[PDB]
Amino acid sequence: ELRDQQEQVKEDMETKCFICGIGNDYFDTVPHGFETHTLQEHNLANYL
């Protein structure tokens, strides 16, 4: 169960944005779109 919980956390944070919740593929229509969105536009550290 601990392993499954860790894997679920990793999958969620890799497949959907923390703030808006939009999936990764929509941003990935532009190359590196998900990384750009989650590290420049909707970064939680930026909100903090």
Add this chain to the structure above:
Amino acid sequence: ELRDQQEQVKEDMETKCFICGIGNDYFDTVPHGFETHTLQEHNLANYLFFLMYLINKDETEHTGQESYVWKMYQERCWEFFPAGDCFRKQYEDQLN
């Protein structure tokens, strides 16, 4: 955990293309589309053979595309690799 990792590897390689990353269903709109795309258009062995041929080919004899890829590879920029796009998606309307 080892079994789960093996299953995850199999599922990823069966559901999405290695290079572009587009899902299997989009190609599967055409019969055998995913297999055709992953074995003829975006085959990783084909990219390996292209790098081999470009390395073993003389620089003066390079064509325009080969020179472009050669410069990009020398500068270690991997933008020439298709990411999120393919020939089918780029020529969707004209091809069909």
Add this chain to the structure above:
Amino acid sequence: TMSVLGHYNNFFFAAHLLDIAMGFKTLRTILSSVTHNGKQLVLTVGLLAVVVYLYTVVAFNFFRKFYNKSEDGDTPDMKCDDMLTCYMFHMYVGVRAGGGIGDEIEDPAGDEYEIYRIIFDITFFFFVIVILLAIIQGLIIDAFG
């Protein structure tokens, strides 16, 4: 009825402690591990009984001389002269033993059936003690998962 009989014999009140399974849901979650695969748990015991019966057949036909269980040399307590007694021995003592039937039967050292008996004991330990009990534990863990 149990409560009424408890007046005649006060120890009949101990049966009421079996109500904790229904009393507590958290204990029901634990018991679900056993009850989830109960049919397979019973079939595992049936298969174990068949395997032990086969071993009893082999021992009764070939290794009957190593089942003396008496220290006094005057009176020998042979436990495999009877098929039912040999099966009871194998199912009780051999199964409950940590090392198998060889932990309880006589040493085969310096015997013309030494190799066959050693194979007998090793196979008993591997198939019965190791594999089948592991099957039971795996059933419980699989029920949890």
Add this chain to the structure above:
Amino acid sequence: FWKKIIAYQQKLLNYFARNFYNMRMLALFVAFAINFILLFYKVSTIAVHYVLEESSGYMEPTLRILAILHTVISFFCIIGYYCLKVPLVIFKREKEVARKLEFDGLYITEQPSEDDIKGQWDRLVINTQSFPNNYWDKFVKRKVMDKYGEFYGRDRISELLGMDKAALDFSDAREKKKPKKDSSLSAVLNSIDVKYQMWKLGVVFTDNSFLYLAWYMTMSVLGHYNNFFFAAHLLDIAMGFKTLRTILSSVTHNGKQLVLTVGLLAVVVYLYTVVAFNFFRKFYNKSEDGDTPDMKCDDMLTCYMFHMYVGVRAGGGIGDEIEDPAGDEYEIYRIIFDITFFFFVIVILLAIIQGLIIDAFG
């Protein structure tokens, strides 16, 4: 006459094929009854002879009748198998060989690997006239004709497949047919295809399930000479019950890894035996009488047998069975020896086996 006997034969075959499974269940039930009767023998006092002791006195005739019935049902289960399940095997084999002949040319272009029993044995059925006897496609020999005739020689392909050009020319040409009777038994003997039946018998003999049923019948027959041979029939429960098969799948799923685990355990125990034989040979005395010492590690084979039998079956390891190393100049080394033996052999490897079974379940 001929029609009546053929009809009666067909009735018998149909009955056996219909009741094949019920007879297979009945054989198991009779096996459980016989083995329950066998549980009440006594050894009587040299020449020792096995008697059935009972207060009733009937259960010896019960045992005889049950053994005869079990043998008869075992024979009938072979007959029912041959009438019911054999045709499916022949159909599958004829389909496979036909597809290999057509779409692979396994006897025209390339040849069998000479290590394939099926590929070598299937060369006989091609030349037979009764080919697709069970497979529906009766034009496979003409498809091979039309595919490989021009390239590899039409007459050569015809010789391979057994077709006769003169036969077809004779059929097309003008002749006068002469009547024949099925009543002519010499004619029917000439009509039967010896080669095709030989290939069919070979396929049946190479079939695994038919071999299992033959072993069952042989076991049942030997049970008359020795009544305890009927205990081997209790091994049929795995095939009898699917629920028991689900349990056994846990063991059989990782059988290769389970065997390799035992091999690794044997190697580890051999290494420990080497160490003990070279350094700790004085602690392996196994006799209480001080006059005669029963050294168990003076011989390499004896030491290995000791370590594999007693040390492995012991709950604490070899140290539970070898002499206490207290007050010895090799005390620390021997204690490390025992602890490592207990940890690696008793704890880890057995846990590997259990984990294999649980992983198979999952």
Add this chain to the structure above:
Amino acid sequence: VLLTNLSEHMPNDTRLQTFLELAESVLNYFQPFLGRIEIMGSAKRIERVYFEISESSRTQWEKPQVKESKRQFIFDVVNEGGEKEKMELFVNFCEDTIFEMQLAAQISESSILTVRSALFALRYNILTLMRMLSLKSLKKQMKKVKKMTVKDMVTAFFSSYWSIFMTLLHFVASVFRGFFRIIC
């Protein structure tokens, strides 16, 4: 390469189709040696590139060791990897594999008995079973069973399968004897 480029960039062209049929043989010959990839071109468009794959390169790629290396690389890049460095790890693996295949090409310069025994036993034992009918000497038996009885009928029916099971037992014993002789 020219014809393939034209065919792929002009999909629905009946005029080009006929030339494709006329050049079918050459295209079939050169199919293994023709490479095809897609890249993000300088004109901000996806472009297909056609190159030459060598026969030696193909063989060294299909060697089992390179396939195991490919499987390990895929496992690693999938389980522990990121989208940023995926295409860097892939190029590193490609370079290492290319060097190893070139070195392999450089250095690379220049039971049946059991099956036969089983086949022989199977032929011999079944021929023994069929001899009773191949000799065509069953006339005396037919003479003794002119009298048609349902009991004799059923007895012969069972006897056929009994003879089959002796033939199978004999074949199995012969196989075991042959295997023991071969191993010893």
